[PDB]
Every structure is written in C-alpha cells, then in structure tokens.
RNA sequence: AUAACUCAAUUUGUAAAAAAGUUUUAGAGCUAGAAAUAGCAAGUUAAAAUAAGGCUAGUCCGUUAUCAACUUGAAAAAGUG
DNA sequence: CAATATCATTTTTTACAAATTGAGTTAT
DNA sequence: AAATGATATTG
C-alpha cells in the first residue's frame, strides 16, 4: 500500500511517503502538552535540516598541541629541579619570582624584579644584555665565572625554544673555509674536465653563496661570474646541489632516466650509487667536492657570522639583527626629523598606523610594517634601507615567524658550550651536564605516542617496568620495540578470509612470489604450430621466473618472446594472452636484497625463507635504523659488517591483503599442496587465487568459510565524510519513524539518493613551473586568490599555451577562449580540473563526439608528458587526453558512461542501501533464504533533475527548504515507476542478489515512457504484467498537487553545542563583566582574558531575585545561557549553579532545557527558533505558489518551439513580478517583522521596474534571503545592500508555545510557556 | 556485483615535533608646569598562561561522533500517538 | 530599549594505517 | 572560508 523516497544530503534528509496512484497521504496526529489542540493533520512529506557534521581534525590538532604545552612546562620543571639545591644557596626565591612574573605587584608575594629582586641590578642586566642572545653569547664565549641565575635563564631559553628535529645526528658549523671549499669543487672538476677548465678567478663564492637571497638566486649570480658556463651545465647543477636544491643531472650525462639527487634526503647515498655506476666512479670526487662545500654553507640563511669569532653563531646573528636595528632606527629617526617631520609622531607615536610604533607596540606584522614605509623610504634620500627591506632584513625583531629553519643541534651547541664553560666553577653542572642536554634532546618517538597508564583511549605504548618515565630512564622503562610494532600492527588489517591472521608486508618475498605466479598462471602463448593457445608449465614458469623475474626488476612481453620463447623454445613468433606490454607483478624485494647481500644462491635457498620473511617484516614494521639494527643482530653471522650497514638503510612500507597461512601455509587435504603450490604447478588447469578459493573440488573454501564470525557504531565505521555519515544516520532514524507512522507496515519500496583551494594551487604552479624551467611566474606574477578564476588557473597549469594546438596564449584574452572537456560532458558529468582544458576554441580538439583527435594526440603528446612530469596534469588527465591512440571511445565505453549517469556506483551509497535492506528484510523462508519484503531502489539525482526539466516541476533552492522534500517525493515516484515499467532493470537499481549501440540508445531513452510524443499512449503499462505504470491524464496533476502543497514538514534538528568554550583571542584588561578568567585566580579587570563564550544550551529559570538595598525578592522568568564551560558544573547541581548566579527559590521542576534551534510559535502563526539564550533565528517557511516558482526559473533563464512557448509564458505573465513581491511583503510583515528592511526592499524593486525581465527575476531570488528560515543574513537587491534584521532578545518566546518535534515533525508536544 | 595485482589521485583516522601570535609583569623615561598639557627620550628582550579544568594523578585526559517530548534506563537504547 | 558596526589564533615538519576512485591484468 | 552569534558602539 506504500513506498518511501529519501533525499540524503550533508545538511538535509528530505523524505516522502507515496501510495499506488503516486498520491502522498495526509493523516491526523495526536498533539501532546497543555494545549488547546489535541491533534493536527500532516501531509506525509518533509525534511530534517541540521548543521554539517565535522571531522576529528580540529579536535586532534588541539589535542596534540595540549600535549606539547605540558611536555615543555615539564622540560622547564626538569632543569629547575636540578638547580634547586645550589640555587637555594645563591637566591632563596628566584624560581618563585619567576612563576609569579605574570602577577601584578599588588598580587606578587615577592619583589617585582624577577632576576635579582631589586631595581639597580635588574636595570643593569638589561643595559648590558638588551636581549637574552647577548647573554647566550657572553656565557658561551667568556671564561669568567657567571651568576648561577644568568646561567639557568639561557639554559631555559634554549630548552624552552629548542628548534626543530627535522635533521638527524650531529651538526658542527664550519662557515669559514667556503672560499677554499669552492676552489676545491672548481679544481676536482677542472681535473676531470681536463678540456674546459672553470676559471676560479678570485670569484667571491663565500659572499654570493653565504648571501641572503634564495638558493636559485645565489646559483644565478655565482655562475654569472663564470664565463660561458650555463646553470644547466654540469658545474651549475653541482652548485644547485651544494645550495640544498634538487637538480636533474640527466641531459648533462646523456642518460634516459631522472638522475635527480638531494644531499638532505636519506636516499642520496643510493641515488648517487645508481648515477656513479651509470657515468663512472671517476665522478665520485666531484660529488665529494660538492658534499664538502655543502657542510660549510648548509646553514648560511641562519648563521650569517664567521664561526672563527664565536662558538655561538646563532645568538651573534641575532645580536646583529639587533645592532642593525639600532643603527637603522637612529638614522631613520634623524632622516624623518629632517625631510618628513610633519608625519614623525604618526611613525613613532601612533599604534593603529602600522608605523614602527604599530610594529613594536601595536599588532603590525614585519610585512605590514615593511609594506607601510616602502613609500616613505623612497620619497626621501635612503638607498641602503630599501636594499634591506627587499632582503626582508630592515628593522628585524629577534623572535620572528621564520626562526623555524633553526635545528635544535645549533641551540644544543650553545647550551653545551655554556655548561662546558661553567662546570669548571659549578660541580652540579659537571655531574649533570649530560642530564641537562637530554632535556633539550629527548623527544617521545611518534611510534610511542602518549606515555599513558590506562586512561588514554589514544595511547598504545607498553611498559618494560612500572616507574615514572623521564628523558633519562625512557629506554629502560618504555619497551620501545613492542610499542613500535604496536603503533603499526594496531592499524593494519587482519585477513578477511582467515580473520585470525595478520596481513603480510606488501614487500614480503613470498608475497611477491605469490603475486607474480598468480599473474604468470593465466599467461597464454600460441605459435604457427599448436592448434590452440596453451598455459605455462610448472617447469616453464620456474624457468621464466629463474631467467626473467630474478634478473630483470621488470619483465616485458618483448622480453618474454625474445629472452625466453626465442632462446629456449626456438619460436620466431609467439602470441601472449594473459599479460599486456609488461608484468604488473615484480620480484622487487628479491633484486634489492640481491644487490645488498650480493649472494643470489642464499635468496634462492628455500631454507633461509623464514629469516628473509622476518628481515623484510622488520624492514616494514620499524623506520628507526637503530631498532632495525637491533632486530637484525641474530643475522650477524650470515653477512659482512658492510652488508648489515646497507641492509638497515633498506626500509619498506605497505601491507598486503592476505596472510602467510592463506598463500603458502594452508594445504589441500587430497593434494597436501598450498595455494602457492597450485599457482606454481597445477598441471593442465593453471588455476587462479580467486578460483582455488571457490573450486568445490579443493579443500580451500570450507577451510576458509570456517573462520568467519550496533547501528551508530556501524555507520561511524563506514568510509565517507563524517558530514555524510551524519546524513546516513538520520535517513535511517527517519525511515524507522515512517514505518512506526504507517502502524509498523514496511514500504514495498524505499528509494534512496545522495548528493555529490588557493594555498595548494600556487604550490602546484610554483613547483610545476620550477620542475619545468620556465619564466611565466617571474613574468606575470599571480596570488593565491587570483587562481580561483578557473580559466586563469588552467592557463598557468598549461604554461600559458594552448592544450590542443602548440602556440602561445594572451593572459589578457581568456574571456575569448574555451574551457573544453576531454571526455565530453555528454558522457561524464565530471567538471573538475582533471577533465578540463583551455583552448582558443573547442573545435581544435577534433570531433565533438569523442576524446581529442589522433592528429592532436600526435602533435601534443610530447607536450602533455612534460605537464604530467611537472605534476601540472594527473596520470588520469594524461591517460584520457591520449586515449584516442587506443581507438579512443569504443561504442561500448560510450554506452558504459551513459548508464553510469543514472546507475549509482559510489560505495558510500551502496552501504546505505545494504543497511536499510538488512533492517527492512529480517525474515527467512522454508529454504532458509532471506525474504525481500522491501526493495531498496537507489537513484542518481540526474533522473529527477531531467524529470523536473522535461515536465516543468522547476526547482529554485533559494525560495524555501521544501525542495529537499519534493526531490525525495519525485525520487519515490520515478523510482517506483522505472522498475514497475522495466522489471528487468531490478538487477541494477534494486539492492540484493552493435549491442553497445542499443544499450546506449536504450539507457539514453529509458525515461521516455512518461512522454506522450518524442507517439506513446496516454496510459502506460508493463508489457509483461499488464500492471499500469503511468497515466499522463491524471498522474502529472497529482505530482503538481503534491509539489504545490503548502504544509510540508520542515524540521531543524535541535543540537546542544559542543566544542571550544569561547573565542580564542585573549583580550586586554577592561572593566567588563563579559571578560572570562584565563585561569581561576586571574581577575580579568587586572589581567584580561576571554569573551564570546559558546552557549551549550539555554535554560528557562523561573525564580526570585533580590531588588534594591533592603533585598525585596522580585519574581522573574528568563532564559539563562549555560556556556560549554559552565555545563559540567550546571549539570552536577542545577539548583546550586543558579543560586550562586543570584536566582532564589528556583522552581526546579519548571527548568526547561532549550537546545539551539528550539521552536516557538507566536502570534500570527509566526514562529522563532532559539540561537542562544540571547538571540532567535527566523522560524517560518514561505510556501510560494508553483506558478510563481516556475516563472522565477524561466524568467531568470533568459527545443525552439518549447523555447518560444516559454519566453511567451514569461512576457504574457509579467504581472507575476508585482504579485510575488506581495507574497513576500504579506509574509515579511506577518512573521519576519523587518519593517525598515522591507521598505528598502519595496523601494529597491520600484526603481528597477524599468529593467529587463530576466535581471529583475535573478534578484527577486536574492529577496527570498529576507524570508528564509534560520539566521538573518545580508543580501543585495541590485546594488542596494540590505543588512540583516536580527532578533537580539528572547523574551517574546517566554510567553510563546515551545514546540517539541519528532525527526519527521509528525508527532508534536506543544507547551504554552504561561508559567 | 565481488576477490588479488598494477599505476595515479583522493579521503578518513592517529602519533611525534617546530616558529609565531596573543595576554599580564619586568626592563627608573626625562625636563619644564599647580594642572590638565607640552616638548624630547625609548622601542627589537624575557618570565609565565595558551582552552577554565578533571581524577583515574598518567611527562594522562579535556573542542570529533551521538541528542525533541513523555514513561524506562548508568548508558546505549526501549516503550508511547 | 533597538539599530549598527567589528570580530573571529596562524603556520610548519616528520612518521603510519584504512578506505575510495578509475585506468588496466586475471578470476567467481 | 564563510557566516553567524557576541560584543561594544552608536544614534
């Protein structure tokens, strides 16, 4: 008797219930609470609306950082523990004055001067050490005994801001011998290149290299001093190396493969190896001369001082930045006094102005500050100050956005230095030097994570002993292995088939053997002789594997024929059937081990297997070469010191799909042969892995099917956005109430259907243009936000050049060229950067009816490549582009994509359909097979779109939140209709278990049976059953009646607010009540803090409150906003929370919980939704008539007969313009109550009545954002901006009726807040 | 529609780190002048907090997910038209 | 009161697993 | 990244 249609979005679930004549019922429903009404009638259509679900990511980023704050606090707390004993002797309360450094003098327990607890000393420290850097250096360099306090402060500053750990092992600054180390690179070259010596020539390398310009600038200016040596020359590339670049030595040496190196990458030693054994080991002394100059220059950018004058070249570089800032501020003051004194006070007094004033004492960035005085500096006479502003080096602060470069190794340098200096004087610095370094040095390894003890959901790390963990006991108390293993194993899959067993590493030698055989087992070959194509033999496979697979990393078909079938079966010709072009499967790990263990006969020897199957496990499981080393010691006794050294470096990542048991472990009872056996030799039926697992005449399928074995949990475990699994949950909870509503009778059919920047874009270009060698950036600069222009972005991802016709393009002309689609938008409704292309006109592509022509694919393929290489096109885009050189689009492929246009395949959507089927269908028949009482029909949103288009049931999202419902009812309809007509299409749309040309002609014309002509009968019917499917004479009318129905059940899901407590920004002090204490003890009148708390939810307090001096109790009803922070508290004692807010004799059993979007009905059926105890959003949907909806589509939308008939429905029904404004006004006036806005809106319309009919409709659409449900929002009529009329009080709600709604909003509880 | 391989792209989830930013305090401002107010001098650094907090007290946890009403439940979740 | 403007912590490195999509191979 | 609720300012 009935079916459901769902529309499942990320913000909405629309639903609808339909009967056999496509009618949607209308029932009377009980109405609870203390009201007038004991019932209502409710059309059985509606929506649920809801705020987007959100990802863990914010949550997690905030958590990982919380852990960072607490471990650094804890860094300091270690250092301090150490000084405590001997600091007591010097100063009684140093570490005290420091903690209360934040407190105002009034609240300070100790003297207001941190360091020396008086004025005269403190004032002096500062005069002698303006910065901590000045102290850092003095303590490092001076031999003099230093104040224990001054030592601690510098050790703390180094340990509090220790800089990154992105480099491994030790770093020893050598910035002096660069003018030699260059004259050594130049010489070992000139030696090798006997014929073309480079002229050292007293070129200042040290300056041009130790310079403050980009690596790619320093290369230009350094070969600029080398006569007739290009930077694309060998010496030019080598130099790019020494300046931590990635060059491509490939055309230098005449190779045919990317020989790019990078000294900082871990693979350099094995990339260099691959090159030097392509070009010769006479070129080793030239990558030694370029590693040599690298270690003196690695850190120019950061150190900027000769490491002859100091062992603290950082602090010194900062003292410099500082001194420079003195000299340069002195002069800049004077210069302004002279030439521009009129403005001086602005530059140095006014904070809001981005002057030096706003720099230091405002909020002005270096960049803003620098961007402000650009003009000022060059409208005066100075030259060197611009020099500096350009080098971003003008009035530099010591602490800045860019001290990120600084490795810890260099802080540890000075940290060490100092300790080493002062342990001469302080015995406790001697005996704990090593302790104090490891405070700086220690770091919990990412593969251990939280150091928990039972109360972390997050942690996995396992304890070797039950101590408190510390930087100095970590190794001995934390079992690092088991935790490294855990970090990985906990995430990696079990075998779906043997669910007890863990998946093998992707790079497992057996796995590679499995993978290969399973591909070798269906290879077929034919010769002029044999009457049929054969399978490979046991002995032939082995022979292939021996000679081809275990010597070529990659075996080609042209190697199968020429290197096996030729040389071992004397076949001049052969026809291979299983594999195309080359073998997917490869013995990669074999060849890698082969190189490293230099012993073939070991790998081959099947008794070693177990060991080689653990070696590779360990190479996958761990990534710390220390732990790999440890693991691999039990195999000391097999291979040289040198082989172990280069077996550690070898790492692997990735995990199979299958266990060791499944492959080579399980036996057939009959055969005592394993899957690996069956692949390796199955005589005559060279059977597959799929097969072996399904052939009922082998053991392997019962041996599997043996080991086999909540709603909210099930859905949150799917793979989608959490945004779209929020929808999946509600679409179920909806479908349950819609059953409950139909008195627990199950639909005959449920019809589901689901919906479908600038940073990462300039990184894709910048890099693409570099990894290409092209001037277009430096020649037409852009910015993050310009590239959002689709045509602009394209033009740049095509290096300012036509994608079909090698010739330049004019940046200034895009608006004349074409963004053509590769596979055309009449097959694939893909409109991403992957299927899109700028050309001066689409034509040039070739035929409109297919992929780009063989002409173009010829001419251009050389170009496209270079874009693939520059990552300025994906593999996918490359492959589609060129596809015409494999016949392009096959009549079939075509018919393919046009059935994909209506047949959902997206895995997330199948899981919805499966979930529903499995809840709807639970009953079994005599033969104990599932009975399917409910067909879950799934559609694409196209079917209905075109429906709406063809029969004019037009959709204008903007009007109201109704379409969500309409689509779900159109789904229910078309859905039930399609399968009523074409029962055979069940195979595709329903859940459960030459001809191309027709499949296409069919799937393209499926939705015909609705049309009267294209000639079809008025009444339609299933040719087989004789069942009526449609009736052009009275069904369309029922669609138009439903669509037009004015009461539709729209329902904002009410949500208690979660997340951050308030706005993060920490505001000054002010004498406000709004300011919130950043800590319990920190009165924000004195110390400032937080503002704008989020309201978790509002609460109706009726109570009494004291009024005036004598303390008369005045009664009050009002909403109190309970803040996220307050909630824990409020919940644990609602009475006490309100009492210590002022409230008294609170009526505890009148306290109504009011989440966000709580519904109230007021005076003229006017409704308002709660936003907060403090504000309301619009509560009313405006059911515009469909004759007005229809018009507004077409009007706004500028078949030629149809076209004429509809531009002449527009011109003839122009009166509707004034009529629609009216609907808006009667409404805006009745329920919106934005009088002054509404009279701008009326005034705005009246001035543009002389404007085109298209333009005016396009804008009457912007006017609906007045009348829209939810939060008031700003909008433009034409030019006129209409700012949002907000509802900033919640009083009128207190005397309204609260409406408690079901998901569907069919069952209600109405409460008349008259209390 | 399923399973294994291959290549690319994408998404979800986790851990370990870094540089800033922001907030109070500390860096004697000084000469007029009763005063409000002038002139001039200074500015780059640091201590500490970075969800309030929590008990399970860990170098842990503290922003995701889930949520009308009524009866039932610690809860999840059931029952009610 | 209720109109009206201003406001919102930013970024960066490393390490890892799982799904998913879509172009190919081989199968149930 | 908007947009929407907080907030101080304003008329």
UniProtKB/Swiss-Prot annotation:
Q: Which keywords does UniProt give here?
A: Antiviral defense, DNA-binding, Endonuclease, Exonuclease, Hydrolase, Magnesium, Manganese, Metal-binding, Nuclease, RNA-binding
Q: State what changing residue 963 to A does.
A: Decreased DNA cleavage. In vivo, loss of Cas9-mediated CRISPR interference in plasmid transformation
Q: What does this protein do?
A: CRISPR (clustered regularly interspaced short palindromic repeat) is an adaptive immune system that provides protection against mobile genetic elements (viruses, transposable elements and conjugative plasmids). CRISPR clusters contain spacers, sequences complementary to antecedent mobile elements, and target invading nucleic acids. CRISPR clusters are transcribed and processed into CRISPR RNA (crRNA). In type II CRISPR systems correct processing of pre-crRNA requires a trans-encoded small RNA (tracrRNA), endogenous ribonuclease 3 (rnc) and this protein.
Q: Give the span(s) annotated as Recognition lobe.
A: 53-709
Q: How does it assemble?
A: Monomer. Binds crRNA and tracrRNA.
The residue ranges of the HNH Cas9-type domain are 757-902
Q: Where is this region: RuvC-I?
A: 1-59
Organism of origin is Streptococcus pyogenes serotype M1
Q: How is its activity regulated?
A: Only has nuclease activity when bound to both gRNAs (crRNA plus tracrRNA), which results in conformational changes in the protein and formation of a central channel which binds target DNA. Also requires interaction with PAM to trigger catalytic activity. Nuclease activity is inhibited by EDTA.
Q: What is the effect of changing residue 1286 to A?
A: Dramatically reduced target DNA binding, slightly decreased target cleavage
Q: Which residues bind Mn(2+) 2?
A: 7, 964
Q: What is this protein called?
A: CRISPR-associated endonuclease Cas9/Csn1
Free-text note on domains in this protein's UniProt record: Has 2 endonuclease domains. The discontinuous RuvC-like domain (approximately residues 1-62, 718-765 and 925-1102) recognizes and cleaves the target DNA noncomplementary to crRNA while the HNH nuclease domain (residues 810-872) cleaves the target DNA complementary to crRNA. Has a bilobed architecture with a recognition lobe (REC, residues 60-718) and a discontinuous nuclease lobe (NUC, residues 1-59 and 719-1368). The crRNA-target DNA lies in a channel between the 2 lobes. Binding of sgRNA induces large conformational changes further enhanced by target DNA binding. REC recognizes and binds differing regions of an artificial sgRNA in a sequence-independent manner. Deletions of parts of this lobe abolish nuclease activity.
Where, by residue number, is the active site?
Answer: 7, 821
Q: Where is this region: PAM-interacting domain (PI)?
A: 1055-1315
Question: Where, in this chain's numbering, is Mn(2+) 3 bound?
Answer: 1248, 1279
Looking at the keywords, is Ribonucleoprotein present?
no
Uses in industry and biotechnology: Coexpression of Cas9 with an artificial single guide RNA (sgRNA) which fuses the crRNA with the tracrRNA in human cells has shown it is possible to target and modify DNA sequences of interest. Cas9 plus the 2 sgRNAs have also been expressed individually in human and mouse cells to achieve DNA targeting; cleavage efficiencies of the artificial sgRNA were lower that those for systems with the 2 sgRNAs expressed separately. Microinjection of Cas9-encoding mRNA and a synthetic sgRNA into zebrafish embryos induces targeted mutations.
Region of interest (RuvC-III), residue spans: 906-1058
The UniProt record lists the EC number as 3.1.-.-
Outcome (variant: residue 967 to A) = Only cleaves 1 DNA strand, probably the noncomplementary strand. Processes guide RNAs correctly. In vivo, loss of Cas9-mediated CRISPR interference in plasmid transformation
Q: What does the entry's cofactor note say about binding and number? A: Endonuclease activity on target dsDNA requires Mg(2+). The RuvC-like nuclease domain should have 2 divalent cations, while the HNH domain should have 1. Crystals are often soaked in MgCl(2) or MnCl(2+).
Region (RuvC-II) location: 710-756
């Amino acid at each position: 008797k009935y079916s459901i249609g769902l529309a499942i979005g990320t913000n909405s679930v629309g639903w609808a219930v339909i009967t056999d004549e496509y009618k949607v019922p209308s029932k009377k429903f009980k109405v609870l609470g203390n009201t007038d009404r004991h019932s209502i009638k409710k059309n059985l259509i509606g929506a649920l609306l809801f705020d987007s679900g959100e990802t863990a990511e914010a949550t997690r980023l905030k958590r990982t950082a919380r852990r960072r704050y607490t471990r650094r606090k804890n860094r300091i707390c270690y250092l301090q523990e150490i000084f405590s004993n001997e600091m007591a002797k010097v100063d009684d309360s140093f570490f005290h004055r420091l903690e209360e450094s934040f407190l105002v003098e009034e609240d300070k327990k100790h003297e207001r001067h941190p360091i020396f607890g008086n004025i005269v000393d403190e004032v002096a420290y500062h005069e002698k050490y303006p910065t901590i850097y000045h102290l850092r250096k003095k303590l490092v360099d001076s031999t003099d005994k230093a104040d224990l306090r001054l030592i601690y402060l510098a050790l703390a500053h180094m340990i509090k801001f220790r800089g990154h750990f992105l480099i491994e092992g030790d770093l020893n600054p050598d910035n002096s011998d660069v003018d030699k180390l260059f004259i050594q690179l130049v010489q070992t070259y000139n030696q090798l290149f006997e014929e073309n010596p480079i002229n050292a020539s007293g070129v200042d390398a040290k300056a041009i290299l130790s310079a403050r310009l980009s690596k790619s600038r320093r290369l230009e200016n350094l070969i600029a001093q080398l006569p007739g040596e290009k930077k694309n020359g060998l010496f030019g590339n080598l130099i790019a190396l020494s300046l931590g670049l990635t060059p491509n030595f490939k055309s230098n040496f005449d190779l045919a493969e990317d020989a790019k190196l990078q000294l900082s990458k871990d693979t350099y030693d094995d990339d260099l190896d691959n090159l030097l054994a392509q070009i010769g080991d006479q070129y080793a002394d030239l990558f030694l001369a370029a590693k040599n100059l690298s270690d003196a220059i690695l850190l120019s950018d950061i150190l900027r001082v000769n490491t002859e004058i100091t062992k603290a070249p950082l602090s010194a570089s900062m003292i410099k930045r500082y001194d420079e800032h003195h000299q340069d501020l002195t002069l800049l003051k004077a210069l302004v006094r002279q030439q521009l004194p009129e403005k001086y006070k602005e530059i140095f007094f006014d904070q809001s102005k981005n002057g030096y004033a706003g720099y230091i004492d405002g909020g002005a960035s270096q960049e803003e500050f620098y961007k402000f005085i650009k003009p000022i500096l060059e409208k005066m006479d100075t030259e060197e100050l611009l020099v500096k502003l350009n080098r971003e080096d003008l009035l530099r602060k010591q602490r800045t956005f860019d001290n990120g470069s600084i490795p810890h190794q260099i802080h540890l340098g000075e940290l060490h230095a100092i300790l080493r200096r002062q342990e001469d004087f302080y015995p406790f610095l001697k005996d704990n030097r090593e302790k104090i370094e490891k405070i700086l040095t220690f770091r919990i390894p990412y593969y251990v994570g939280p150091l928990a003890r039972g109360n972390s959901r997050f942690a996995w790390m396992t304890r070797k002993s039950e101590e408190t963990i510390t930087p100095w006991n970590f190794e001995e108390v934390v079992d690092k292995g088991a935790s490294a293993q855990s970090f990985i194993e906990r995430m990696t899959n079990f075998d779906k088939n043997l669910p007890n067993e863990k998946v093998l590493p992707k790079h497992s030698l057996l796995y590679e053997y499995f993978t290969v055989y399973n591909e070798l087992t269906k290879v077929k070959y034919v010769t002029e002789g044999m009457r049929k194509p054969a399978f490979l033999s046991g002995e032939q496979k082995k022979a292939i594997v021996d000679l081809l697979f275990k010597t070529n990393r990659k075996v080609t078909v042209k190697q199968l024929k020429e290197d096996y079938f030729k040389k071992i079966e004397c076949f001049d010709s052969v026809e291979i059937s299983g594999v195309e072009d080359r073998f997917n499967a490869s013995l990669g790990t074999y060849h890698d081990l082969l190189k490293i263990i230099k012993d073939k006969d070991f790998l081959d020897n099947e008794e070693n297997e177990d060991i080689l199957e653990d070696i590779v496990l360990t190479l996958t499981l761990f990534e710390d070469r220390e732990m790999i080393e440890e693991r691999l010691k039990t195999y000391a006794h097999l291979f040289d010191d040198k082989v172990m050294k280069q077996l550690k470096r070898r790492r692997y990542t990735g995990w199979g799909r299958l266990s060791r048991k499944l492959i080579n472990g399980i036996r057939d009872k009959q055969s005592g042969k394993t899957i690996l056996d069956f692949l390796k030799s199955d005589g005559f039926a060279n059977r597959n892995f799929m097969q072996l697992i399904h052939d009922d005449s082998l053991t392997f399928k019962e041996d599997i099917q043996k080991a086999q074995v909540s709603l909210h949990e099930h859905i949150a475990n799917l793979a989608g956005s959490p945004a779209i699994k929020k929808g999946i949950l509600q679409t179920v909870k909806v479908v349950d109430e819609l059953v409950k509503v139909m008195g627990r009778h199950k639909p005959e059919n449920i019809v589901i259907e689901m919906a479908r920047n600038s940073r990462e874009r300039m990184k894709r270009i910048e890099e693409g243009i570099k990894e290409l060698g092209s001037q277009i950036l430096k020649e037409h600069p852009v910015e993050n936000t310009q590239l959002q222009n689709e045509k602009l972005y394209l033009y740049y991802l095509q290096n300012g050049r036509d994608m079909y016709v090698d010739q330049e393009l004019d940046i200034n002309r895009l608006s004349d060229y074409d963004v053509d689609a590769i596979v055309p938008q009449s097959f694939l409704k893909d409109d991403s950067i992957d299927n899109k292309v700028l050309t001066r006109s689409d034509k040039n592509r070739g035929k409109s009816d297919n992929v780009p022509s063989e002409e173009v694919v010829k001419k251009m393929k050389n170009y496209w490549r270079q874009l693939l290489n520059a990552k300025l096109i994906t593999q996918r885009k490359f492959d589609n582009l060129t596809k015409a050189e494999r016949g392009g689009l096959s009549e079939l492929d075509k018919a393919g994509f046009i059935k994909r246009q209506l047949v959902e395949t997206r895995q997330i959507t199948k899981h919805v359909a499966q979930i529903l089927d499995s809840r709807m269908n639970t009953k079994y028949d005599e033969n104990d097979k599932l009975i399917r009482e409910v067909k879950v029909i799934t559609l694409k949103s196209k079917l209905v779109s075109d429906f709406r288009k063809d029969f004019q049931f037009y959709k204008v999202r903007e009007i109201n939140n109704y379409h969500h419902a309409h689509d779900a009812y159109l789904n229910a309809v078309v859905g039930t209709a399609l399968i009523k007509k074409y029962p055979k299409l069940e195979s595709e749309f329903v859940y459960g278990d030459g001809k191309a040309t027709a499949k296409y002609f069919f799937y393209s014309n499926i939705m015909n049976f609705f049309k009267t002509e294209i000639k079809r009968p008025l009444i339609e019917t299933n040719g087989e059953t004789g069942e009526i499917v449609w009736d052009k004479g009275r069904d369309f009318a029922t669609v138009r009646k439903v669509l037009s129905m004015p009461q539709v059940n729209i329902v904002k899901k009410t949500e208690v607010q979660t997340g951050g407590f308030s706005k993060e920004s920490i505001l000054p002090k002010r004498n406000s009540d709004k300011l919130i204490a950043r800590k319990k003890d920190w009165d924000p009148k004195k110390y400032g803090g937080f503002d704008s708390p989020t309201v978790a939810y509002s609460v109706l307090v009726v109570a009494k409150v004291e009024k005036g001096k004598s303390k008369k109790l005045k009664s009050v009803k009002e909403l109190l906003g309970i803040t996220i922070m307050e909630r824990s508290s409020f919940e644990k004692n609602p009475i006490d929370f309100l009492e210590a807010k002022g409230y008294k004799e609170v009526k505890k059993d009148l306290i109504i919980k009011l989440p966000k979007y709580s519904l109230f009905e007021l005076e003229n059926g006017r409704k308002r939704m709660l936003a907060s105890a403090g504000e309301l959003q619009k509560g009313n949907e405006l059911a515009l008539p469909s004759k007005y909806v229809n018009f507004l589509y077409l009007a706004s939308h500028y078949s030629p007969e149809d076209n004429e008939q509809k531009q002449l429905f527009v011109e003839q029904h122009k009166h509707y313009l004034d009529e629609i404004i009216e609907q808006i006004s009667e409404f805006s006036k009745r329920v919106i109550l934005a009088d002054a806005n509404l009279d701008k809106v009326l005034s705005a319309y009246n001035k543009h009545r002389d404007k085109p009919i298209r333009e005016q409709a396009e804008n009457i659409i912007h006017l609906f954002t007045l009348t829209n449900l939810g939060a008031p929002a700003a909008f433009k009529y034409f030019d006129t901006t209409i700012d949002r009329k907000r509802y900033t009080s919640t009083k009128e709600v207190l005397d309204a009726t609260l409406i408690h709604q079901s998901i569907t909003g069919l069952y209600e509880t109405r409460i008349d807040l008259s209390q």
